[PDB]
Design a protein around this ligand. Structure first.
Ligand SMILES: *O[C@@H]1[C@H](O)[C@@H](COP(=O)(O)OP(=O)(O)OP(=O)(O)O)O[C@H]1n1cnc2c(=O)[nH]c(N)nc21
Ligand SMILES: Nc1ncnc2c1ncn2[C@@H]1O[C@H](COP(=O)(O)OP(=O)(O)OP(=O)(O)O)C[C@H]1O
Ligand SMILES: [Mg+2]
Ligand SMILES: [Zn+2]
Lengths: 48, 50, 99, 34, 122, 97, 166, 89, 86, 76
RNA sequence: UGCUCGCUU
């Protein structure tokens, strides 16, 4: 009927592990690809 | 301070635990002496010693 | 003005004021005078319990105009705040639940 | 409209340097902070 | 919220019935309005499971009877699942052990069925 | 904000932080620098250690290991800037117990 | 029905201190695991008992009492061969809709093994003659949250004879 | 003692501070922010939350002061409550 | 000037050069068949250790019938150090 | 049993703050307050009466722990 | 937003 899933847990950060990302991991993390050099549109609304 | 136009800051805690800790640890009656050498700083001043 | 020194180690906070000082020997060493104008602005969140229920009722009935009072009420069930300058403060006081 | 009473008397009244759109009937704070 | 073992120990329906009855009596003795209003699914599940176990013949059972039945079946080298099913169902007919009960081949022997019926009916 | 004309608040400088540390009022320092200044709730994925949104991790395309966490908005901005600089901080969360 | 060991960090607010800690923990665990299906475990019914209960901490945050409690709870999870007795709460063309008594309407017996007179013409016709028995075959669980049910199981009804009802 | 606890007199400057301390966050907040951050990213050094500076940065109660110990509630309870006996097993 | 692009490049850009077809012959066919036979016969070899199954549900009389049986090779403990004896 | 039997100011402050928060969250009072609308004042009264149901769990650097009751410790 | 300037601490 209903599945058991925890709502919130009192999670505490233990330690920060610094590192680096490969280009594949960067692509996976990113959502879209930015290729246009302009900022706003040509119309008078100046929409991005 | 010397009361010659000095501006001082006043903060109000927003938590009961912070309020209690400020009143206990940072109490004026509990911090009458400095930790440098134990000499009392909160004492008489001009117009009181005379 | 960096993120480590300007936004992490030392950062600006609310519920604070800055004012000039003046001497007053008639107060204790552990006491400080606060003006009514800054007192009406700096508010403290008190939780409605079985002890100060009547005091909070009286404060709400007084409202934001009179010095002893409050400015906003956040219900226990819903987190939608309510401004005391508008609405029936008497009804808001009569409908003060614990928490 | 107001989420509590459903009224449309939503006025933008800044209370001591705090921009706040609040209902003018029951005082329910609709939005606060900018 | 992790679990350590989902199959720690199997239990028959009598233990579940006793637990449900105890929870129900404790609930009706210490009913709390706000606790009940916070989650009403507990009451529904408890009541419906109790009603199902009541519809079942699980009544008229006791730990002494369960222990006697277990000791009687221990001499039949039957498996825990078989004896659990037999205790939960209380079969009064022979066909229920002949066909419905699994692992029938080489286990019935056409002579142990009478003893099984006598033990489950006693 | 900074200025009074801009409706700005006071600044608890590094010296104020040092005074609070010397006093040892840990809860007071926390309420001042985290709760009342830049309190925010973020979503961190327990698998990759990255920051999620609305209880969802776009990196792993899953939401089972995503958990909420209190964090200063300045600290979140620092983490984002480091991730942009390619210095990825991987946060390994655990129970408070 | 089977026992399952669990370890939960229960948070009790301060206004429940007058109550007994064990009773409050039991009530909270029941309210949290009432009518919910734990993945790869099954549908939990209620709390059976509490085995270990260590010290109760109080965090500098919410201020409530957090207790790590080890307990055993009863869950409905057959062993792939258990026999059950349910009631027909409907029927579909592709398969009957049997439901255990007021317990769960999730049993979906596939009609692909009975004698060769099996068909459902949507008129709630169970089967052409020559308390309904069920034999659990396999379990299956699934997740729910996948964007910014969970227990059906397979049922079998072999040529059991059923001298009482065809 | 803090200056001469590693067997060598280390000054309070950035060099001695880096030689004594280990918190990447503290070393970055003090001086040479980008250099220390890139060095830590290269070394893959994991930084704990034991220090006061990183505690304040992450917004958690520091270990020093009132946060060194923990408090327990004196609730009416009974450790290891009686267990219900299993009849079938 | 370089023109502005509205949509991103295709995830898999087309190429006018195609891979050269594979070499044909009885030798290549026999090598393929032998590699397939090795794939099929090396999984059942005792050296191919499988993940030990655990968490058995129950014990049954059909356990002896469904018991997986397979001969196990005996390593040479004279050549292998003593740290690998069971 | 090896630590100092006196209750430090940090412990005093933390216990008072926790008790004030609990009382503000509708916790039962064990001193029968007489018109005290301040949770911190109620907590100070409970501390002076030695009726705060809180046990300090002092942790040693190595990992060991020891429990000390408020009524067991010495106040100033 | 950035910066500069002039100022009380
Ligand atoms: O940085 C400032 C300031 O922090 C921020 C404050 O917002 P407002 O500009 O006051 O917006 P408001 O809501 O008041 O106006 P509107 O009704 O929405 O149109 O804005 C930034 N800011 C203010 N003035 C600025 C300026 O002239 N130039 C730059 N760069 N930033 C400005
Ligand atoms: N740059 C600054 N940094 C820190 N504090 C300052 C600074 N400028 C002024 N102050 C504040 O003002 C005070 C300085 O006053 P002080 O120098 O003692 O007297 P004065 O200004 O010499 O007066 P007289 O000339 O002696 O009459 C102390 C300090 O808190
Ligand atoms: Mg001056
Ligand atoms: Zn992830």
């Amino acid at each position: 009927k209903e599945q058991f899933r925890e709502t919130d847990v009192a999670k505490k950060i233990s330690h920060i592990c610094f590192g680096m990302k490969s280009p594949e991991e960067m692509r996976q993390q990113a959502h879209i690809q930015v290729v246009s050099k302009n900022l706003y549109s040509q119309d008078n609304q100046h929409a991005p | 301070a010397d009361f010659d136009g000095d501006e001082m800051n006043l903060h109000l805690p927003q938590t009961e635990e912070a309020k209690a800790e400020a009143l206990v640890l940072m109490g004026t009656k509990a911090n009458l002496v400095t930790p440098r050498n134990g000499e009392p700083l909160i004492a008489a001043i001009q117009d009181f010693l005379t | 003005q960096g993120r480590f020194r300007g936004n992490l180690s030392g950062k600006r906070v609310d519920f604070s004021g800055r004012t000039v000082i003046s001497p007053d020997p008639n107060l204790r060493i552990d006491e400080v005078a606060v003006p009514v104008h800054v007192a009406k602005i700096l508010t403290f969140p008190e939780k409605v319990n079985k002890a100060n229920i009547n005091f909070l009722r009286k404060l709400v009935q007084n409202g934001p105009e009179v010095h002893p009072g409050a400015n906003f009420i956040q219900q226990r069930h819903t987190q939608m705040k309510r401004f005391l300058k508008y609405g029936n403060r008497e009804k808001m006081a009569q409908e003060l639940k614990y928490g | 409209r107001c989420p509590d009473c459903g009224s449309t008397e939503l006025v933008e009244d800044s209370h001591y340097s705090q921009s706040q759109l609040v209902c003018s009937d029951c005082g329910c704070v609709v939005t606060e902070g900018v | 919220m992790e679990v350590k073992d989902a199959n720690s120990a199997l239990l028959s329906n009598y233990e579940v019935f006793q637990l449900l009855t105890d929870l129900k009596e404790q609930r009706k003795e210490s009913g709390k309005n706000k606790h009940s209003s916070g989650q009403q699914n507990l009451n529904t599940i408890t009541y419906e499971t109790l009603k199902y176990i009541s519809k079942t013949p699980c009544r008229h059972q006791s730990p002494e009877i369960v222990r006697e039945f277990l000791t009687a079946l221990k001499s039949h080298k039957l498996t825990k699942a078989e004896k659990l099913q037999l205790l939960n169902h209380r079969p009064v007919t022979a066909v229920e052990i002949q066909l419905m009960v699994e692992e029938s081949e080489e286990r019935l022997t056409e002579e142990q069925i009478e003893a099984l019926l006598h033990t489950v009916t006693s | 904000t900074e200025g009074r004309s801009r409706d700005g608040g006071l600044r608890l400088g590094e010296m104020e932080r040092d005074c609070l540390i010397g006093y040892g009022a840990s809860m007071l320092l926390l309420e001042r620098l985290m709760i009342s200044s830049d309190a925010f709730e973020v979503d961190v994925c327990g698998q990759c250690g990255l920051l999620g949104y609305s209880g969802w991790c776009h990196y792993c395309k899953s939401s089972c290991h995503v958990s909420s966490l209190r964090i200063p908005y300045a600290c979140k901005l620092l983490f984002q800037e480091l991730q942009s600089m390619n210095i990825i901080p991987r946060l390994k969360l655990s129970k408070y117990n | 029905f089977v026992l399952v060991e669990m370890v939960d960090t229960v948070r009790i607010p301060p206004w429940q201190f007058e109550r007994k800690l064990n009773d409050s923990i039991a009530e909270e665990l029941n309210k949290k695991l009432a009518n919910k299906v734990v993945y790869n475990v099954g549908l939990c019914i209620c709390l059976f008992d509490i085995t270990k209960l260590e010290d109760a901490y109080v965090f500098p945050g919410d201020g409530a009492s957090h207790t790590k409690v080890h307990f055993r709870c009863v869950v409905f999870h057959p062993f792939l061969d258990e026999i059950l007795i349910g009631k027909i709460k409907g029927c579909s063309p592709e398969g009957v809709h049997v439901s255990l008594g007021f317990f769960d309407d999730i049993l979906i017996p596939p009609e692909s093994l009975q004698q060769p007179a099996k068909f459902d013409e949507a008129e709630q016709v169970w089967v052409w003659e020559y308390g309904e028995e069920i034999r659990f075959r396999v379990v299956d669980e699934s997740f729910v949250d996948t964007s910014p049910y969970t227990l059906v199981g397979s049922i079998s009804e072999p040529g059991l004879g059923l001298l009482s009802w065809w | 003692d803090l200056m001469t606890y590693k067997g060598e007199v280390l000054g309070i400057t950035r060099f001695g501070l880096a030689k004594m301390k280990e918190s990447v966050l503290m070393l970055a907040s003090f001086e040479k922010t980008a250099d220390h951050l890139f060095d830590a990213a290269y070394f893959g050094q994991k930084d704990s939350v034991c220090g006061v500076s990183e505690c304040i940065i992450m917004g958690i109660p520091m270990n020093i002061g009132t946060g060194l110990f923990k408090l327990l509630h004196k609730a009416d309870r009974d450790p290891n409550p009686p267990k219900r006996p299993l009849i079938f097993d | 000037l370089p023109d502005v692009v509205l949509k991103p490049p295709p995830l898999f850009p087309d190429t006018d050069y195609k891979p050269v077809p594979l070499k044909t012959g009885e030798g290549e066919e026999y090598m393929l068949a032998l590699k397939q036979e090795l794939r099929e016969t090396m999984k059942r070899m005792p050296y191919f250790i499988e993940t030990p199954e655990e968490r058995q549900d129950i014990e049954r009389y059909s356990k002896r019938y469904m018991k997986v049986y397979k001969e196990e090779w005996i390593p040479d403990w004279r050549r292998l150090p003593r740290e690998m004896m069971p | 049993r090896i630590t100092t039997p006196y209750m430090t100011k940090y412990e005093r402050a933390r216990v008072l703050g926790t008790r004030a928060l609990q009382i503000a969250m509708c916790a039962p009072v064990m001193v029968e307050l007489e018109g005290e609308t301040d949770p911190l004042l109620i907590a100070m009264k409970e501390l002076k009466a030695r009726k705060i149901p809180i046990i300090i769990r002092r942790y040693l650097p190595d990992g060991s722990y020891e429990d000390w009751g408020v009524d067991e410790l010495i106040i100033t």
